[PDB]
Short mmCIF file of C-alpha atoms in Angstrom, two decimals:
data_model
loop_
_atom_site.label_atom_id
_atom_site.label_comp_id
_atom_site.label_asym_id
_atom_site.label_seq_id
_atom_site.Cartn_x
_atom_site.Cartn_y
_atom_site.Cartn_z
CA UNK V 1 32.85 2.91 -43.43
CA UNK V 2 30.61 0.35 -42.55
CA UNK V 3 33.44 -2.16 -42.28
CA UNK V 4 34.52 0.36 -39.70
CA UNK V 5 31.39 0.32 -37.66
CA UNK V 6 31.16 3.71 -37.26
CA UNK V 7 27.41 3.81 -37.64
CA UNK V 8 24.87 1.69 -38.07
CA UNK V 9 23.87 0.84 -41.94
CA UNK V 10 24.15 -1.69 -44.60
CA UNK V 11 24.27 -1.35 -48.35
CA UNK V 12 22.60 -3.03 -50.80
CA UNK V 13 23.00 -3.93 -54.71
CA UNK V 14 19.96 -5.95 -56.10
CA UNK V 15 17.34 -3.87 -54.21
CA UNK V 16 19.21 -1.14 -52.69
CA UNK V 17 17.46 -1.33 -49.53
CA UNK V 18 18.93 0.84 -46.71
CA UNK V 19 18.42 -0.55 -43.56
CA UNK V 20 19.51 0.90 -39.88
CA UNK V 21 19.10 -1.01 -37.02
CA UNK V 22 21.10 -1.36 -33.52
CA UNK V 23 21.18 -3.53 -30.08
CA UNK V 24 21.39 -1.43 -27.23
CA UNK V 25 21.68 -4.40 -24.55
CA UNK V 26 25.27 -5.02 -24.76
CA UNK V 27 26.53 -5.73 -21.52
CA UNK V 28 23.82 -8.54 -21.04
CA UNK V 29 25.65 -11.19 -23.37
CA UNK V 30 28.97 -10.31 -21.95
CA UNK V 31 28.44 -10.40 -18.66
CA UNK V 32 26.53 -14.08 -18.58
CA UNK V 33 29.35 -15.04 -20.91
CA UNK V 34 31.80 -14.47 -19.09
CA UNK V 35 30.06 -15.73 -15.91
CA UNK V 36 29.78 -18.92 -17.50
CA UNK V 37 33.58 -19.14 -18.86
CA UNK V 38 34.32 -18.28 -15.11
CA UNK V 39 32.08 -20.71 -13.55
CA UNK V 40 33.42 -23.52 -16.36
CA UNK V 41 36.77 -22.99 -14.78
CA UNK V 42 34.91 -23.76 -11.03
CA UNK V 43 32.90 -26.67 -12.58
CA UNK V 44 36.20 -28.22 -13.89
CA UNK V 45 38.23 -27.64 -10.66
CA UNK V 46 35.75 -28.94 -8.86
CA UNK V 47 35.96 -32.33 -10.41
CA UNK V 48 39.66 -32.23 -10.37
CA UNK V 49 38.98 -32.16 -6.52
CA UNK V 50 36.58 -34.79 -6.60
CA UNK V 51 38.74 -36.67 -9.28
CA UNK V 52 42.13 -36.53 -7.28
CA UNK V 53 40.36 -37.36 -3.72
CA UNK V 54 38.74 -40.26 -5.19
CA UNK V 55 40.77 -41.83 -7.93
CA UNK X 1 18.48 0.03 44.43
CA UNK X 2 18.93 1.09 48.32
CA UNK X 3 15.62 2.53 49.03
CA UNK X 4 14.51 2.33 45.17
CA UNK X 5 12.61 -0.52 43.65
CA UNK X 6 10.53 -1.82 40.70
CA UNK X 7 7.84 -3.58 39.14
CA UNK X 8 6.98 -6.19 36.47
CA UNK X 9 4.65 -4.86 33.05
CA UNK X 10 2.78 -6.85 31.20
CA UNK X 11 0.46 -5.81 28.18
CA UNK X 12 -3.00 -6.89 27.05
CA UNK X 13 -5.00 -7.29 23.92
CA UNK X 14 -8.57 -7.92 22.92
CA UNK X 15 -9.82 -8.48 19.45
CA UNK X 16 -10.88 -5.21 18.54
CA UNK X 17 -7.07 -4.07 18.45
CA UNK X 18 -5.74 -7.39 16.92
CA UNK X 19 -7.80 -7.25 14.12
CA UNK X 20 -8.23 -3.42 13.86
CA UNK X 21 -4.32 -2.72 14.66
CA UNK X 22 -2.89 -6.28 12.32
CA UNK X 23 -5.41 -5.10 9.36
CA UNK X 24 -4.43 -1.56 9.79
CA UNK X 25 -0.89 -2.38 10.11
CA UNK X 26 -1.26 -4.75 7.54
CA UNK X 27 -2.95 -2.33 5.19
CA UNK X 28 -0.26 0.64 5.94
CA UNK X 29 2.02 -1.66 4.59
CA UNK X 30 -0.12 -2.34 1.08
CA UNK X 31 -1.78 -0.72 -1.30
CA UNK X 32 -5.22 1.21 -1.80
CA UNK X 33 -6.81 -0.67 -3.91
CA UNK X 34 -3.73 -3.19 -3.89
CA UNK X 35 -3.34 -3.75 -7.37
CA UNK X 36 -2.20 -0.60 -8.32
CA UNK X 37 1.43 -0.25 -6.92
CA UNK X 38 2.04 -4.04 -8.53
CA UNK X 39 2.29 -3.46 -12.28
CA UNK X 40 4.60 -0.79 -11.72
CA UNK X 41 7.60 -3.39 -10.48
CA UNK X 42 6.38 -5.90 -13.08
CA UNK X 43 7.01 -3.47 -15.65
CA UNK X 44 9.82 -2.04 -13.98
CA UNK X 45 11.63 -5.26 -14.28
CA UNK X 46 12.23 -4.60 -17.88
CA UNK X 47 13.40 -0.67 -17.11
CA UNK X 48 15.18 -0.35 -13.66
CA UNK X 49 15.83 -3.60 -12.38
CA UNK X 50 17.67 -4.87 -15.77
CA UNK X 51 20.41 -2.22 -14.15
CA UNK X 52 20.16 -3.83 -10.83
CA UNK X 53 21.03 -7.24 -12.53
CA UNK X 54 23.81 -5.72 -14.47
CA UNK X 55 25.50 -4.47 -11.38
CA UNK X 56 24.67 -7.68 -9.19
CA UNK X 57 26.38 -9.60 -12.02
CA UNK K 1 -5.77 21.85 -3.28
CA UNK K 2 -4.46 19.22 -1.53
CA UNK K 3 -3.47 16.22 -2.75
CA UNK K 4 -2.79 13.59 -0.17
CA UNK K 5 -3.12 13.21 3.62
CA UNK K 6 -1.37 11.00 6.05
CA UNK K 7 -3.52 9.76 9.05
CA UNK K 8 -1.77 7.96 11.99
CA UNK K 9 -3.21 5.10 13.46
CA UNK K 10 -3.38 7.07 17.09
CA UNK K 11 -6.81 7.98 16.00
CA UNK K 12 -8.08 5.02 14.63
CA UNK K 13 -7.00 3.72 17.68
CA UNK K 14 -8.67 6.39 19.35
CA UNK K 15 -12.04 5.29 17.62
CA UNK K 16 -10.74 1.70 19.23
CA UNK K 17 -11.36 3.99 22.45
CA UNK K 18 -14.81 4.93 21.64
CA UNK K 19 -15.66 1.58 21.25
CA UNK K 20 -13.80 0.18 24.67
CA UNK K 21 -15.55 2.99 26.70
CA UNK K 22 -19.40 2.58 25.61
CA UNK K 23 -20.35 0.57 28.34
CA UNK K 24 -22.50 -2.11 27.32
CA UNK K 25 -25.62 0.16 27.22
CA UNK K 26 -26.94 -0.63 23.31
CA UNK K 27 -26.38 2.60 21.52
CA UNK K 28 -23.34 2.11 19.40
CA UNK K 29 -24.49 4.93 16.93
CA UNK K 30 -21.99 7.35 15.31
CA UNK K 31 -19.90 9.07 17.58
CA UNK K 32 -18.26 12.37 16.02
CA UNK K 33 -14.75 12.90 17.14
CA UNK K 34 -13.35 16.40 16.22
CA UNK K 35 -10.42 15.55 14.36
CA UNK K 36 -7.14 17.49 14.28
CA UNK K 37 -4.02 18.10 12.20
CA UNK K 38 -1.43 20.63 10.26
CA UNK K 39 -3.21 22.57 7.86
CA UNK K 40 -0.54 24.34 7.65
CA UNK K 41 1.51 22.72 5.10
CA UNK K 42 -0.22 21.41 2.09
CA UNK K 43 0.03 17.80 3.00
CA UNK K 44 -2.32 17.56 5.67
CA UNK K 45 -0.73 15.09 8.85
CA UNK K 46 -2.96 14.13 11.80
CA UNK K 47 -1.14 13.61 15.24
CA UNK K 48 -4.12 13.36 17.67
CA UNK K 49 -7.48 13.95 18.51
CA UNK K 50 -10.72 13.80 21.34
CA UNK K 51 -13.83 13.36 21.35
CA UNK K 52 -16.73 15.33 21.43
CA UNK K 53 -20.65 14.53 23.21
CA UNK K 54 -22.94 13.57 19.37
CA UNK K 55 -26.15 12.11 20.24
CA UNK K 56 -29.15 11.81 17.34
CA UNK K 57 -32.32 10.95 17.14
CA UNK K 58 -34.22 7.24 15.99
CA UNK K 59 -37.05 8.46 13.84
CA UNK K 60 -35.65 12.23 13.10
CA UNK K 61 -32.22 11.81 10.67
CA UNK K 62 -31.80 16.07 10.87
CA UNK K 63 -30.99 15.79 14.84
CA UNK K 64 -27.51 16.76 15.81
CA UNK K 65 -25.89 17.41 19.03
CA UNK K 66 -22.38 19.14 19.47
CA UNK K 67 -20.52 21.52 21.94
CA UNK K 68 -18.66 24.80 21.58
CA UNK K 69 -17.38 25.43 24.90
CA UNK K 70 -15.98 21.69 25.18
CA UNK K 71 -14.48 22.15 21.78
CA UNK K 72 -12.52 25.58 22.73
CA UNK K 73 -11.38 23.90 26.13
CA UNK K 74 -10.40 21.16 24.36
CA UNK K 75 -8.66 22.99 22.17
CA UNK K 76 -7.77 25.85 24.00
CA UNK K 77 -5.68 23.47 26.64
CA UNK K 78 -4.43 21.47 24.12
CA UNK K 79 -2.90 24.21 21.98
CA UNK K 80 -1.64 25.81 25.51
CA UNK K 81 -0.04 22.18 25.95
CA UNK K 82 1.12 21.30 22.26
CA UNK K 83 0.73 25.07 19.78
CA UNK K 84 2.02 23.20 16.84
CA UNK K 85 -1.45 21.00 15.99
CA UNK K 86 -4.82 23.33 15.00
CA UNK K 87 -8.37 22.32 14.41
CA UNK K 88 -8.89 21.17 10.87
CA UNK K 89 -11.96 19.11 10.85
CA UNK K 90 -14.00 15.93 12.37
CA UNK K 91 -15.06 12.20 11.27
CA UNK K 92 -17.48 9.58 11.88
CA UNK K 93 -17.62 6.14 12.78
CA UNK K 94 -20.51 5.66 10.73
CA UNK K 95 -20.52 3.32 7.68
CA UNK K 96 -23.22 5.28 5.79
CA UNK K 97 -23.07 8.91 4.86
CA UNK K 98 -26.61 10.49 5.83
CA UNK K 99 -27.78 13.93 5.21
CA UNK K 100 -27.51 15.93 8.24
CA UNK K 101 -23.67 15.34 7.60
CA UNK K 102 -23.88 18.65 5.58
CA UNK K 103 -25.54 20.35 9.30
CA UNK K 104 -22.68 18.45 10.60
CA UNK K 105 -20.17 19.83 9.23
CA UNK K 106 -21.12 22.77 8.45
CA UNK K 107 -20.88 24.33 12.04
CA UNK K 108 -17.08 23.31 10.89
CA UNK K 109 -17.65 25.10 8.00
CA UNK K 110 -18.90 28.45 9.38
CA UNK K 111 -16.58 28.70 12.74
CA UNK K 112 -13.77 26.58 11.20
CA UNK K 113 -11.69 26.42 7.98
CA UNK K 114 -12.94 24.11 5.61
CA UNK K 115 -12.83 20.73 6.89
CA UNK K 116 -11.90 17.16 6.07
CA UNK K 117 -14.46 13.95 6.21
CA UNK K 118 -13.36 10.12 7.15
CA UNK K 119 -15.83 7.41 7.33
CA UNK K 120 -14.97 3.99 8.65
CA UNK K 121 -16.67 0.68 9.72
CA UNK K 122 -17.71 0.21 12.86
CA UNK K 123 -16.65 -3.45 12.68
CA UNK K 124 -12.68 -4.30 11.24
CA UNK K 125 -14.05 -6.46 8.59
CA UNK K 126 -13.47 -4.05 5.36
CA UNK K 127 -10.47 -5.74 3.94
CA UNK K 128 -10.12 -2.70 1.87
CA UNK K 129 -8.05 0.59 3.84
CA UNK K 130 -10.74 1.89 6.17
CA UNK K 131 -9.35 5.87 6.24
CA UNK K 132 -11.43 7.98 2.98
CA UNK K 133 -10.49 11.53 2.75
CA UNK K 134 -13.65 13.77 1.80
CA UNK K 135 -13.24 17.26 1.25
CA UNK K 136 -15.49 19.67 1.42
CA UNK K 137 -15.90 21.59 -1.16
CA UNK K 138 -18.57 23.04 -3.38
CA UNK K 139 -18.56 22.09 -7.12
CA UNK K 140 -20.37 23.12 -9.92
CA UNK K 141 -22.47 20.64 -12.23
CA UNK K 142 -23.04 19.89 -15.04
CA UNK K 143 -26.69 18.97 -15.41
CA UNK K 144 -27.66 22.15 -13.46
CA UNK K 145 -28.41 20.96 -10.10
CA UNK K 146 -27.97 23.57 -7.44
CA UNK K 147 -24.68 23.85 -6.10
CA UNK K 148 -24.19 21.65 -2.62
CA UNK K 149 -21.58 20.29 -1.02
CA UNK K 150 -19.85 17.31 -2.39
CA UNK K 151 -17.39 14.70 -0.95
CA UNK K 152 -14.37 14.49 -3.22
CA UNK K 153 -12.34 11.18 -2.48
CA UNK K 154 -8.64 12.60 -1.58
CA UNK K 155 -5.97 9.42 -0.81
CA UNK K 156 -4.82 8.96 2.04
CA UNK K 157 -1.61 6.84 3.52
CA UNK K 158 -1.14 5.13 7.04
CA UNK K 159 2.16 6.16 7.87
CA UNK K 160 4.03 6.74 11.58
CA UNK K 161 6.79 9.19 11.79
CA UNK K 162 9.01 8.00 14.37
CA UNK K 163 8.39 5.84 17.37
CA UNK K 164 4.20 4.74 16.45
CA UNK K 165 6.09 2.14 14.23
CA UNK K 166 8.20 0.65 16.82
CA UNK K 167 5.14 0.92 20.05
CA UNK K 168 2.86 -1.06 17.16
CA UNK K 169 5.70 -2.97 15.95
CA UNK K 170 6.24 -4.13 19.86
CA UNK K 171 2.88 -4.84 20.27
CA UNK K 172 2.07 -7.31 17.62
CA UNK K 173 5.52 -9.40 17.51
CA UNK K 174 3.47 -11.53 14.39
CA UNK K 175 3.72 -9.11 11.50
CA UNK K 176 6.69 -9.15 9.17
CA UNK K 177 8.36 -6.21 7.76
CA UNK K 178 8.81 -5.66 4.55
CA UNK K 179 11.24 -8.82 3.83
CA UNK K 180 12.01 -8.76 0.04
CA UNK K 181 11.84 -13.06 -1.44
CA UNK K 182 9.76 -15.23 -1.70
CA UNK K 183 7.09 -15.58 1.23
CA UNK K 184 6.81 -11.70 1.17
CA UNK K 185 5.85 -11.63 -2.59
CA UNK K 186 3.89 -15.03 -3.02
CA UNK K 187 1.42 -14.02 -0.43
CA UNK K 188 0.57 -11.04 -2.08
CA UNK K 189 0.48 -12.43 -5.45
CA UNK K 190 -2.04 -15.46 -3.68
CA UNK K 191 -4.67 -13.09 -1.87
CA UNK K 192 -4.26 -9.80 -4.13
CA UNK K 193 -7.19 -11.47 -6.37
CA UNK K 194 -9.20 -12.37 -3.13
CA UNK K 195 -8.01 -8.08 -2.30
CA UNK K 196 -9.66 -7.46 -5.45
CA UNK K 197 -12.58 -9.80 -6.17
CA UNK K 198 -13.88 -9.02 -2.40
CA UNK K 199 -13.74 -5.24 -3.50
CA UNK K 200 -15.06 -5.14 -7.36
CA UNK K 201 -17.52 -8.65 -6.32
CA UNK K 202 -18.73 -6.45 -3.40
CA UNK K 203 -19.56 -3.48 -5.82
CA UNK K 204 -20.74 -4.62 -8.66
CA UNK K 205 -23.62 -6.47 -7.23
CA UNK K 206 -25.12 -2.86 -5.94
CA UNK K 207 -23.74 -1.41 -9.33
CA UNK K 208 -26.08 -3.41 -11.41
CA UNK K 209 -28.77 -2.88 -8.79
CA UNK K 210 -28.92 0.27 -8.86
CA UNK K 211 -28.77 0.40 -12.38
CA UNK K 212 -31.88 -1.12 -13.10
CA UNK K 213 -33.53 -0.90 -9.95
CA UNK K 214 -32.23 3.10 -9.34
CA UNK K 215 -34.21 6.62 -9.02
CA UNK K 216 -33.03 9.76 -7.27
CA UNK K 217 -30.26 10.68 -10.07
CA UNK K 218 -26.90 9.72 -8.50
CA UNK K 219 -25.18 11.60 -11.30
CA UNK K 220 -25.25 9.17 -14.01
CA UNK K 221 -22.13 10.97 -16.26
CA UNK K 222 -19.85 9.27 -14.47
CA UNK K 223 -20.49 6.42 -15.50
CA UNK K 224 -20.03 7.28 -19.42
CA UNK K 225 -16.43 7.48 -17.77
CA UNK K 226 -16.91 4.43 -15.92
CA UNK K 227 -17.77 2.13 -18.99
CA UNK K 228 -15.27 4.47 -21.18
CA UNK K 229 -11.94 3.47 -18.95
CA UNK K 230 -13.78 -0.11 -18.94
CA UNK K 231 -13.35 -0.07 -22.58
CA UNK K 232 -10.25 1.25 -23.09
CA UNK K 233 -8.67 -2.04 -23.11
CA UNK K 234 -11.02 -3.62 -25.89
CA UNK K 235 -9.04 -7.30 -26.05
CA UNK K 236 -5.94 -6.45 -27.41
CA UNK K 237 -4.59 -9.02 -30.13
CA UNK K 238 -0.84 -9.00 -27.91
CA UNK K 239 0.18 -9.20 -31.42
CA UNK K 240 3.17 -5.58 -31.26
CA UNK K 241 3.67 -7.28 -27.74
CA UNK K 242 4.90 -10.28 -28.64
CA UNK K 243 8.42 -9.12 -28.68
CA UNK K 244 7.84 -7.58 -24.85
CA UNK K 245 7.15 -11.28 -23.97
CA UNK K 246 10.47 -12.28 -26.20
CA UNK K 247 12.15 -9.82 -23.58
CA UNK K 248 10.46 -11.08 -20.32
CA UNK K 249 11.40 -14.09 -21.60
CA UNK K 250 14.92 -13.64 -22.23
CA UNK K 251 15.07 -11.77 -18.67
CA UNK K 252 13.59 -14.91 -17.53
CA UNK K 253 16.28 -17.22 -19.25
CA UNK K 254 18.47 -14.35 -17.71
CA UNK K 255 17.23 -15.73 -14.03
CA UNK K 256 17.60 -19.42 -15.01
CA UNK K 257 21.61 -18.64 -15.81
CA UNK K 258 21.78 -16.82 -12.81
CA UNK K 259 19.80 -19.34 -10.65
CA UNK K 260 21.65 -22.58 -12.57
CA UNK K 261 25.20 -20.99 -12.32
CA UNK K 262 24.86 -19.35 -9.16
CA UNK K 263 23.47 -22.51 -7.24
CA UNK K 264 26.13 -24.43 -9.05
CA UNK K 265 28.91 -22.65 -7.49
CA UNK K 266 27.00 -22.72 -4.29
CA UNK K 267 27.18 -26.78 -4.49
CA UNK K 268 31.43 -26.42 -4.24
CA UNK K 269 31.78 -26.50 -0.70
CA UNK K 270 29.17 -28.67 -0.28
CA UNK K 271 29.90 -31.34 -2.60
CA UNK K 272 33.46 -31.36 -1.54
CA UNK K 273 32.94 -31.30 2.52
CA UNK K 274 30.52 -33.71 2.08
CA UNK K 275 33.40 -36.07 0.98
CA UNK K 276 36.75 -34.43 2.61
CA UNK K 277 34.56 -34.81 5.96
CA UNK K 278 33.29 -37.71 5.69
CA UNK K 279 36.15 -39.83 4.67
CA UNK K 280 38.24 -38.22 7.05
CA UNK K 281 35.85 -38.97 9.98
CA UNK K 282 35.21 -42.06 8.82
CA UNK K 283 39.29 -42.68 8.20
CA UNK K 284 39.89 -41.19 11.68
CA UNK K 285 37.34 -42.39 13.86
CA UNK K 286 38.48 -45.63 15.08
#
């Protein structure tokens, strides 16, 4: 059930320690990520500009 | 304009209502004490603003 | 009972008035104006207000000159003209609050509802906001001194309604709105510690003079409050905040992604005209 990410938890054999924890500021890492894959795309077009009106 | 004419305006100032009016002006524009309305946007930053990021990325 | 006030600048403008008409004849000395406003609703708004003849005496501190009949023609031909504004309560251009205040405004008191107090400086250089809201009321105290009237700070705000902001706005052409960026912000966050240090520099010199060098009690409990909010920040160790700064921080890398990124898309058209233009004019020009 915790393979299915249902909740949060984790199990534990040595110790049995249950620990709950979570990370509420999701759409943070997302967004930048995929304003950087986006931006890669302008980055790399832009030197295919450059590239083909100089060489 | 037959029969019906105007006249140039001009304003004046003295010192008394530069500084008075600017300051006053000035000051209904800021704070009391103006240090108390500050911490509230620094420490907003973290609570309201983080969704006005989000939505201006 | 009431919690904040808003006070246009007509009036203060008006006390700009009462010094433009003296005359050059040496007095200068308090002038009471008989201040006016909507006591109706709770928040109390001043629109306008006159003047009224105040004269004291040198020597004598207990002399006190006012008017009635001036004050109901004033007010009876300004409520025949404008019904909507009442009497509410006067102020003073002095700096320092003497004791016949209390004779003052108590003629307010007795004929009038319970009115408000503003002192200001005579001279615009208070950095600080010159408008004070002092009610008068009567409190009871603690060390069993007989009940008098007391001044209870009430905050106020400098605010026009509708056209004061443009006619002042007109005027001045040199002050900036509110303009969100950089200039805006770093000139606040450049004089807010001169704002301050002017203000708490200013006061603590006749703080710790009085302290030492003070009789005539001038209710010393407050300042077991005083001292207490003083030392309710006793040097934090900013050791539980450290992760706070780990998420300032990451905001902060946050603003260099955006600022990086953003300015790097921003350098497109720019770093390409500046070659398809050039090349081209240079190609085609002769």
């Amino acid at each position: 059930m915790i393979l299915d990410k249902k909740f949060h938890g984790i199990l534990d054999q040595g110790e049995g320690v249950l620990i709950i924890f979570d990370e509420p500021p999701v759409d943070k890492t997302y967004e930048a990520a995929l304003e950087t894959i986006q931006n890669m795309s302008k980055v790399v077009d832009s030197l295919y500009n450059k590239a083909k009106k100089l060489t | 304009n037959r029969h019906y004419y105007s006249i140039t305006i001009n304003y004046r100032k003295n010192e008394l209502e530069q500084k008075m009016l600017l300051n006053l002006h000035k000051k209904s524009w800021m704070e009391g004490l103006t240090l108390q309305d500050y911490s509230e946007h620094c420490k907003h930053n973290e609570s309201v603003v983080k969704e006005m990021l989000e939505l201006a990325k | 009972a009431v919690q904040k006030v808003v006070v246009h600048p007509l009036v203060l403008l008006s006390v700009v008035d009462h010094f433009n008409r003296i005359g050059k004849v040496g007095n200068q000395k308090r002038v009471v104006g008989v201040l006016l406003g909507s006591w109706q609703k709770k928040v109390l708004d001043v629109s306008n207000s006159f003047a009224v003849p105040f004269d004291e005496d040198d020597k004598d501190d207990s002399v006190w000159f006012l008017d009635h009949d001036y004050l109901e023609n004033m007010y009876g031909m300004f409520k025949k003209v404008n019904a909507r504004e009442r009497i509410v309560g006067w102020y003073h251009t002095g700096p320092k609050l003497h004791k016949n205040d209390i004779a003052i405004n108590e003629l307010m008191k007795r004929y009038c509802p319970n009115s408000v107090l503003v002192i200001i400086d005579v001279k615009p250089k208070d950095l600080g906001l010159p408008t004070e809201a002092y009610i008068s009321v009567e409190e009871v105290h603690d060390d069993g001194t007989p009940t008098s009237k007391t001044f209870e700070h009430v905050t106020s705000e400098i605010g026009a309604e509708e056209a004061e902001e443009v006619g002042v706005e007109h005027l001045l052409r040199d002050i900036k709105d509110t303009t969100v960026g950089t200039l805006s912000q770093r000139i606040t966050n450049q004089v807010h510690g001169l704002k301050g240090l002017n203000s708490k520099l200013l006061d603590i010199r006749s703080y710790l003079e009085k302290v030492a060098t003070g009789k005539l009690p001038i209710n010393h409990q407050i300042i077991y409050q005083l001292q207490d909010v003083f030392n309710l920040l006793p040097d934090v160790s900013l050791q539980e905040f450290v992760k706070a700064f780990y998420l300032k921080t990451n905001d902060q890398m946050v603003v260099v992604y955006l600022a990086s990124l953003i300015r790097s898309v921003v350098a497109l058209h720019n770093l390409i005209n500046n070659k398809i233009a050039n090349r081209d004019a240079e190609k085609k020009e002769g």
